[PDB]
Antibody
Framework: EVKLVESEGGLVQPGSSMKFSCTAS????????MAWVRQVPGKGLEWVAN????????DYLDSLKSRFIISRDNAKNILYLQMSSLKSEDTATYYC???????????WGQGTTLTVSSAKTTAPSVYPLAPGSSVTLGCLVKGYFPEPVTLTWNSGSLSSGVHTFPAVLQSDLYTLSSSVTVTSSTWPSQSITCNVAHPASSTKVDKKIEPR | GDIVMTQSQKFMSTSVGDRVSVTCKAS??????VAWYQQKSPKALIY??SYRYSGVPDRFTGSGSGTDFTLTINNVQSEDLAYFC?????????FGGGTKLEIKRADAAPTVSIFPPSSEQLTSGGASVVCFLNNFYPKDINVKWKIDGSERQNGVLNSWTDQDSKDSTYSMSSTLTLTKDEYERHNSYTCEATHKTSTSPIVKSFNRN
C-alpha cells in the first residue's frame, strides 16, 4: 500500500527552525510530485509547497516562501520541509501528500502536529467525577499545555458509552472532560478507571472512580 | 495570489440512506481542475471534477466545470466525516472550508448528570461543578446554572461533541468553575437543561452538605 510517514512534531519556541521529513513507501517515489499541506482545526486546509519529480522546480505559498524550503531525496524516498523563524501562526498539523500528475493529492500522510508557542509545558490535573439501570462516571482534565491528551477507560477495554469532549482553551491552559456510562449493577463491582496521557509532559495519570 | 473555493454550507441536512449533494464555488474559472476529499487525514475521492480514483465506490459522483462544482453522495450513512473541495488550476492550490452531513433521527431527551468538586481539586483551591448532557437530538439545547436558586453565568465553560457516527446523537459538557472560597459560601448547585423534547427543563442538583 502507498504509505507516507511524517517525522516527529511537537512544541517549539517562536523564532526557532525545524526540518520535517516524510518517508515514502509502496510506490515509485520519483514518479510523482510531492507536496506539504497544513491544517489548523476549524480553519481548513492550507497548501504550503510542492516539488517536481527530480526536485528541480519547487513551488511555495508566497506568504511562506520567505521561511520554508521543500526538498526531496529519491534515493532514500523521503520528502523534507525546512521551516525557519517559526511564528505561532505556523501552529498546525502538517501532512505530506502525493500529488497526482494533474495536481490532486491521492494519498496523504498521517499528519504531525507542530505547536509554536512560548507557553510552558504543563502536566494535567485529573479529577474523578463520582455520583436507574445505568450510571454515568467521569474524569475532569484541567490545566495542561499543549494539546493533546489521550483519555481511555480501563486502559482502552471500556470503549462503549464514552464521550470525551473537545478541549477548551482558558488562559493558555486546556481543560476537557470525559464521561462513561455503564450498567448500574457493574459499578463499583467491576472497577472503572480513566487513563489520561499527556505525551508533551511525559505524564500519564490513572484515576479509579469510587463512590463518595 | 488566491483563487477562493467557497463551500457556503458548513452543514448539510439529510437522512440515512438518502442521496445528497455538496456544493463548491470557485471565485475564478478553474475549468475542471477540482478535487474532492473526505476527512474525519483526508482521503481522496474525485479528481478532474468528475473522475473517481481506483477504489472509490460509485456512490460518489463529481459534477461541474468552470466555477460551480458539486459532490453527490448516495446511500449516506452515519459517519464522522466532512467533505472538502480543492482547486489545482493555479498556484497557490486552495481548499474549500468543508461541509459536514447531519443525519436525521428521532428526537431524544438528554441524559443529565451533575458532579460536585472532587476532594483533590478543593485541596488546590478550585471548585468545578460538571454537568453532562448526553445523547440528545436535535443538537439545539440550552443549559442554565443556578446557585442557591440564582442564575449564574460567569465561570461556565461548554464543550460539544460532533454528531456521533453510530447513534446520530449529540452530547454536551458544561463546567462551572469557582474558587473554593465562593463554593463554600453557597449550598445548592443546579444544572438545568432546556430541550425541545419537553417544555419543562430537566433539573439536576446537589447540596454541598
Amino acid at each position: 500500500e502507498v504509505k507516507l510517514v511524517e517525522s516527529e512534531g511537537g512544541l517549539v519556541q517562536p523564532g526557532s527552525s525545524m526540518k520535517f521529513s516524510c518517508t515514502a513507501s509502496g510506490f515509485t517515489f520519483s514518479d510523482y510530485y510531492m507536496a506539504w499541506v497544513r491544517q489548523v482545526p476549524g480553519k481548513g486546509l492550507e497548501w504550503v509547497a510542492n516539488i517536481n519529480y527530480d526536485g528541480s522546480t519547487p513551488d511555495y505559498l508566497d506568504s511562506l516562501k520567505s521561511r520554508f524550503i521543500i526538498s526531496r531525496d529519491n534515493a532514500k524516498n523521503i520528502l523534507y520541509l525546512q521551516m525557519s523563524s517559526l511564528k505561532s501562526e505556523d501552529t498546525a498539523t502538517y501532512y505530506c501528500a502525493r500529488e497526482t500528475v494533474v495536481g490532486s493529492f491521492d494519498y496523504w500522510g498521517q499528519g504531525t502536529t507542530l505547536t509554536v508557542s512560548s507557553a510552558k509545558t504543563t502536566a494535567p490535573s485529573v479529577y474523578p467525577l463520582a455520583p436507574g439501570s445505568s450510571v454515568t462516571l467521569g474524569c475532569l482534565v484541567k490545566g495542561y499545555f499543549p494539546e493533546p491528551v489521550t483519555l481511555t477507560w480501563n486502559s482502552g477495554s471500556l470503549s462503549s458509552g464514552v464521550h470525551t469532549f473537545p478541549a477548551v482553551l482558558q488562559s493558555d491552559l486546556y481543560t476537557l472532560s470525559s464521561s462513561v456510562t455503564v450498567t448500574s449493577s457493574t459499578w463499583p463491582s467491576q472497577s472503572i478507571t480513566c487513563n489520561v496521557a499527556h505525551p508533551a509532559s511525559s505524564t500519564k495519570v490513572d484515576k479509579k472512580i469510587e463512590p463518595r | 495570489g488566491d483563487i477562493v473555493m467557497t463551500q457556503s454550507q458548513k452543514f448539510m441536512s439529510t437522512s440515512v440512506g438518502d442521496r445528497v449533494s455538496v456544493t463548491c464555488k470557485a471565485s475564478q474559472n478553474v475549468g475542471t481542475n477540482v478535487a474532492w476529499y473526505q476527512q474525519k487525514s483526508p482521503k481522496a475521492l474525485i479528481y478532474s471534477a468528475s473522475y473517481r480514483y481506483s477504489g472509490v465506490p460509485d456512490r460518489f459522483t463529481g459534477s461541474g466545470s468552470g466555477t460551480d462544482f458539486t459532490l453527490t453522495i448516495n446511500n449516506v450513512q452515519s459517519e464522522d466525516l466532512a467533505y472538502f473541495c480543492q482547486q489545482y488550476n493555479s498556484y497557490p492550490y486552495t481548499f474549500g472550508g468543508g461541509t459536514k452531513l447531519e443525519i436525521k433521527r428521532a428526537d431524544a431527551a438528554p441524559t443529565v448528570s451533575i458532579f460536585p468538586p472532587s476532594s483533590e481539586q478543593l485541596t488546590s483551591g478550585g471548585a468545578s461543578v460538571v454537568c453532562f448532557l448526553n445523547n440528545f437530538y436535535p443538537k439545539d439545547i440550552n443549559v442554565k446554572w443556578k446557585i442557591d436558586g440564582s442564575e449564574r453565568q460567569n465561570g461556565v465553560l461548554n464543550s460539544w461533541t460532533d454528531q456521533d457516527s453510530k447513534d446520530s446523537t449529540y452530547s454536551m459538557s458544561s463546567t462551572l468553575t469557582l474558587t473554593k472560597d465562593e463554593y463554600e459560601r453557597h449550598n445548592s448547585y443546579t444544572c438545568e437543561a432546556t430541550h425541545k423534547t419537553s417544555t419543562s427543563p430537566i433539573v439536576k442538583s446537589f447540596n454541598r452538605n
